[PDB]
A paper describes a structure:
Here we report cryo-electron microscopic structures of the heme translocation complex CcmABCD from E. coli, alone and bound to the heme chaperone CcmE. Our data suggest that the complex flops a heme group from the inner to the outer leaflet at its CcmBC interfaces, driven by ATP hydrolysis at CcmA. A conserved heme-handling motif (WxWD) at the periplasmic side of CcmC rotates the heme by 90° for covalent attachment to the heme chaperone CcmE that we find interacting exclusively with the CcmB subunit.
No heme was bound in this sample, and we obtained one data set that contained CcmA without and one with bound ATP, with only minor changes to the overall conformation of the complex. The binding sites for ATP were located close to the interface of the CcmA dimer, with residue S130 from the other monomer involved in the coordination of the ATP phosphates. ATP bound to its canonical position in this class of proteins, with the P-loop cradling the triphosphate near the switch I and switch II regions and the lid loop. Unexpectedly, the overall stoichiometry of the CcmABCD changed for the E154QA variant, in that the closure of the core ABC transporter Ccm(AB)2 consistently led to the loss of one copy of CcmCD, resulting in a Ccm(E154QAB)2CD complex. In contrast, the observed conformational change of the outer protomer of CcmB in the ATP-bound state or the E154QA variant complex implies that an adjacent CcmC protomer would have to either dissociate from the complex or change its own conformation in response. The closure of the dimeric transporter induced a conformational change of helices hI and hV in only one monomer of the CcmB dimer that is not compatible with the observed binding mode of CcmC to CcmB, as on the cytoplasmic side of the membrane, helix hV of CcmB was pushed outward, leading to a clash with helix hIV of CcmC. It seems feasible that such a rearrangement results in the effective ejection of the CcmCD module from the complex, and it is quite remarkable that it occurs only in one protomer of the CcmB dimer, while the other almost completely retains its open-state conformation with CcmCD in place. The model had the core ABC transporter Ccm(AB)2 in a closed state, very similar to the ATP-bound E154QA variant complex.
Author numbering:
A (entry chain A): 2 to 203
B (entry chain D): 2 to 63
C (entry chain C): 3 to 243
D (entry chain B), E (entry chain b): 2 to 220
F (entry chain a): 1 to 203
């Protein structure tokens, strides 16, 4: 049904990272791509979002390839990479207001308050520290209604309280049919039965 | 058979010798450079991978 | 058939290595025959004098410069419609050959216009067009050499070549329009003679064959360079070693 | 989401007011420099003005063209801009429209002082303003694919100029011919129609290939 | 560390075996841009050569001037360059001298080709080469204080762009006047001595102030 | 006496005092880890300790001298790692490490890159290197330097567990000899509490 893989071969730069991965996702999942430093767990996620063209094999979304279903795929997804994805020139409020809704107080100032950024709405971006620069893009995640969450390294420059603050929301999304694909290095405070582990096969 | 009978006169290209011979040398030399360099590159890249593989085998032994 | 297995690069290397020496011998013998017959056993022009025979040294290369840009299109466009790298390498194979041919055309035109204009370079027709073609080849060279990767470099060079090929006739007509007004020029390009017009065609064929030799052997160069690790290169160097 | 992208790009261009003044002062430095360097004789100024003005406009838009896609990849906002529920060519069109509105429209706003700095007439000023209006969107559309090719590269120098300027040569020739023929009080309606046809062709072709080159440079 | 930084900046500037030709081809692009608008007559181009060559030099210097400091902020290596065991003014002098090698040495190399293209004489070519050798480092040394303040400022202003490109007035005016006075056979050493004194003053005053500006910009 | 003494630091940024009157002297051979919260000054303390930022109040003391005249000796014995790696991405790893001292020959190069986990990744450009490997290139500097004082803001970020283990081992070997490392990370580093020293932010 949901994001599925078929014979994903992504050998490039005169080397091979992985071969023949055909993992499927159904409704209400939680996967973590496992590997080492320099094993290719971001190229896989970029190919999952459709940023990079696959060398061999295809990703499918309700049984259709990603190059014609792109409207619904982009409607029902958000992607947070290593780059923050926000403008450094503006302040936090309109950088958040770029993404969907926000605006009135029904989803404004408390999506930022829940990310630990209460009282920091009209302040420009680089007048905050890289951790809360990441927390702006993570406070985007509290006001979106996208079914497919893809997060590369969300626990980057994030406090010990911010890990639990993220993970509670992550699990709450996992209850109501939320498919999430995260790449991370810090261990989670989640039992292994809840989280699937799509390992990159060699 | 040529319009210039004398061999010295053939090199004195009807009073316009220097322009024609400059054009001849500055056509001949770019093609010579384009061939010699691009075949020296072939030899150096083949020899490059050969002496790369020799060092790779030495380090695999080590 | 043979076209689908032409995409496998050891087979392409073997086919190109078979194709190089006979075609190179034909190129050099046709070029020698044309140059000897033209610069020797042939008359000259009444008006231009005895520098007239620079019509040889300019006219094939120049038109084939335009021609090889057309070749660029039938590489890059196909390399952007079946998404093939084997076609996208032909752009970087044919780029500096076209740049050298266009520079030679500019040099021969500037040297041939000296008995008339008095100055080495004057701002006349078709020489500005060749200079713009040289700039387009320079852009292809710089865009290929600037990328650190090879596949991205090939696709970017294909995009640039398609854009330049689309924009080329507009430039070709606008530079001609720049010569219709702003005074004029003499007909120094292709003023031919009835007893002269045959080794011109032979030298056109010879320069085409030499360009084919150079692009085939540079395609061999780029094929050997791009795949540094794949074991067909190991088999080839074991045959050599 | 279309006009939201346009308003956001205008806001982020006005927040970066600094790279907006260097091409404007470059147009000013060329327009100031050429007659004072050459001389105050008005016989040759009336012929040299269409060339100097439009080459200054070309190089000023070249100078401004670097901020169009360089800052978006480093902040990573382009990877999200490709992911909004609307096609990437329309995002390209909105961003290049914001590029023209933030920098090319100050050229139209300042062309009063440019015309009065070097002579001209009322009809000459009218052809000045109309040619700049018809040609600066053309220049931006023509220079968009070169910037879309040079995104992942860290080269911020002569490469974009080499890619762009031979493509914008015929726009330069036609616009300079239009202004020169207007300086002799001859009707230039056909030349303006040629410039409009160039603008329509660039509007048809440039956003369909700039997005493709941008997708090439991001993988 | 001095010559190592110089070689490093050369290594970043030229990345492949055949990459030094790009500043040479951009120059010929500008020198083919100007007669393509103004006209094909060697007489007018001989009259207006100073503005053409110095606008090409200005555009090259200001186009390559961003990569001095804007690249090093987003990369982050400028902080560890400041933490290097060597004074900041000599580091800045190495960086801007390498930048001059990116731009000024192409000027001096392509000087006879552009002297042959836009019609001039041997005395004009000699004057052009001498004043370009004496003026391109001045252009870099006056342009770097503005960029040093510009890239390291959030709030910023249009008023910060006043420090960089408006500062170009005296050198360009004096050099174009020297070329125009040397177009006719007149003595020219009186302005050349002024340009040499300007080079001495810029070489004395640029890195000392620009190091302080670089200390101000990042905090 | 300690050769790094931070005295009476006051940092006010937009009507907030990050820290006022913070003072600590660092004796030879120890392991300060600056803690704090997201939105607290545990960078503008390391950055101010390096001398990049001028203090509003208080100052930094190196070997009994302030930081505005002993710069040539202070920059010779310091190694700063920031959030940004500080490496030219267009080059490869080899000349990027050869910018800094030693490297070059195989005595100090090709093995400091190998100990960081980048074996076979020396002549590849940093553009196609992974972000973890991009930071690993900058963090490979610890294995070739002789700098006594190390100041590392977030060293163990985007780095797998074996990399953190090797980095902590190398940092322990540097800590046993004469040398002070000041880091700031969010995850608890797998070391005993007895040797690490926590200088917390006060408000
Ligand atoms: N587009 C690409 N396609 C294939 N391989 C790549 C590509 N870009 C970089 N590589 C190579 O593959 C590895 C990069 O893969 P990738 O960056 O996805 O790993 P990674 O998971 O990001 O590493 P980390 O987990 O530390 O982030 C590197 O060894 C690099 O040389
Ligand atoms: N130069 C500055 N730039 C931006 N913000 C600053 C600066 N100086 C002080 N601040 C403010 O001070 C606070 C602390 O800044 P700092 O960057 O030190 O936090 P940090 O310790 O780096 O946070 P993190 O743990 O995420 O790195 C921030 O909330 C920020 O708003
Ligand atoms: Mg990654
Ligand atoms: Mg920090």
């Amino acid at each position: 049904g949901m994001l599925e893989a078929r014979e994903l071969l992504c050998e490039r730069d005169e080397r091979t990272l992985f071969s023949g991965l055909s993992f499927t996702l159904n409704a209400g999942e939680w996967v973590q791509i496992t590997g080492s430093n320099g094993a290719g767990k971001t190229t896989l996620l970029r190919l999952l979002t459709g940023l990079s063209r696959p060398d061999a094999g295809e990703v499918l979304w309700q049984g259709q390839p990603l190059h014609q279903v792109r409207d619904s795929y982009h409607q029902n997804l958000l992607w947070i990479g290593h780059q923050p994805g926000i403008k450094t020139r503006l302040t936090a409020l309109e950088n958040l207001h770029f993404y969907h809704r926000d605006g009135d107080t029904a989803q404004c100032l408390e999506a930022l308050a829940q990310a630990g950024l209460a009282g920091f709405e009209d302040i420009p971006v680089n007048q905050l520290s890289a951790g809360q620069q990441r927390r702006v893009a993570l406070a985007r995640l509290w006001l979106t209604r996208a079914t497919l969450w893809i997060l590369d390294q969300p626990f980057t420059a994030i406090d010990v309280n911010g890990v639990d603050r993220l993970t509670q929301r992550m699990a709450q999304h996992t209850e109501q049919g939320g498919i999430v694909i995260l790449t991370t290095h810090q261990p989670l405070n989640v039992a292994e039965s809840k989280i699937r582990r799509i390992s990159l096969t060699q | 058979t040529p319009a210039f009978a004398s061999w010295n006169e053939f090199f004195a290209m009807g009073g316009y010798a220097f322009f024609v011979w400059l054009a001849v040398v500055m056509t001949v030399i770019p093609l010579v450079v384009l061939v010699v360099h691009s075949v020296m590159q072939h030899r150096a890249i083949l020899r490059g991978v050969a002496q790369q593989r020799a060092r790779e085998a030495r380090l695999r032994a080590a | 058939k043979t076209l689908h297995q032409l995409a496998i690069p050891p087979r392409l290397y073997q086919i190109c290595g078979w194709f190089i020496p006979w075609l190179a011998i034909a190129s050099v013998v046709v070029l020698t025959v044309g140059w000897i017959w033209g610069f020797g056993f042939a008359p000259a022009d009444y008006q231009q004098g005895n520098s007239y025979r620079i019509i040889y040294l300019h006219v094939p290369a120049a038109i084939w410069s335009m021609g090889i840009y057309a070749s660029m299109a039938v590489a890059a466009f196909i390399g952007l419609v079946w998404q093939m790298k084997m076609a996208n390498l032909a752009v970087a194979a044919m780029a500096p050959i076209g740049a050298v041919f266009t520079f030679i055309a500019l040099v021969t035109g500037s040297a041939w216009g000296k008995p008339m204009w008095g100055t080495w370079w004057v701002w006349d027709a078709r020489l500005t067009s060749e200079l713009v073609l040289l700039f387009l080849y320079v852009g292809v060279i710089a865009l290929w050499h600037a990328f650190d990767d090879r596949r991205l470099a090939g696709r970017a060079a294909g995009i640039l070549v398609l854009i330049g090929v689309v924009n080329l006739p507009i430039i070709h007509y606008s530079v001609e329009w720049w010569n219709t007004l702003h005074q004029g020029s003499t007909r120094m390009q292709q003023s031919i003679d009835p007893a002269m017009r045959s080794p011109l065609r032979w030298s056109i064929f010879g320069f085409l064959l030499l360009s084919a030799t150079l692009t085939l052997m540079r395609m061999r160069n780029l094929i050997l360079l791009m795949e540094k690790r794949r074991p067909w290169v190991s088999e080839l160097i074991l045959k050599r070693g | 989401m279309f006009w939201r992208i346009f308003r956001l790009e205008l806001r982020v261009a006005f927040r970066h007011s600094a790279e907006i003044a260097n091409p404007l002062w470059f147009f000013l430095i060329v327009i100031t420099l050429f007659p004072l360097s050459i001389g105050p004789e008005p016989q040759l100024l009336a012929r040299i003005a269409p060339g100097i003005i439009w080459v200054a406009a070309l190089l000023s838009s070249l100078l401004a063209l670097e901020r169009l896609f360089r800052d978006d990849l480093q902040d990573g906002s382009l990877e999200q801009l490709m992911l909004l529920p609307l096609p990437l060519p329309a995002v390209v069109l909105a961003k290049v429209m914001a590029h023209w509105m933030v920098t090319g429209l100050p050229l139209l706003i300042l062309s009063p002082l440019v015309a009065m700095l070097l002579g001209m007439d009322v009809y000459g000023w009218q052809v000045m303003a109309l040619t700049l209006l018809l040609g600066t969107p053309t220049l931006g559309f023509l220079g968009a694919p070169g910037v879309a090719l040079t995104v992942g590269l860290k080269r911020g120098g002569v490469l974009l100029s080499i890619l762009v300027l031979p493509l914008t040569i015929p726009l330069l020739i036609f616009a300079t011919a239009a202004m020169d023929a207007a300086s002799m009080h001859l009707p230039v309606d056909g030349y303006l129609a040629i410039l409009g046809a160039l603008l329509a062709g660039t509007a048809t072709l440039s956003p369909f290939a700039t997005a493709a080159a941008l997708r090439i440079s991001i993988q």
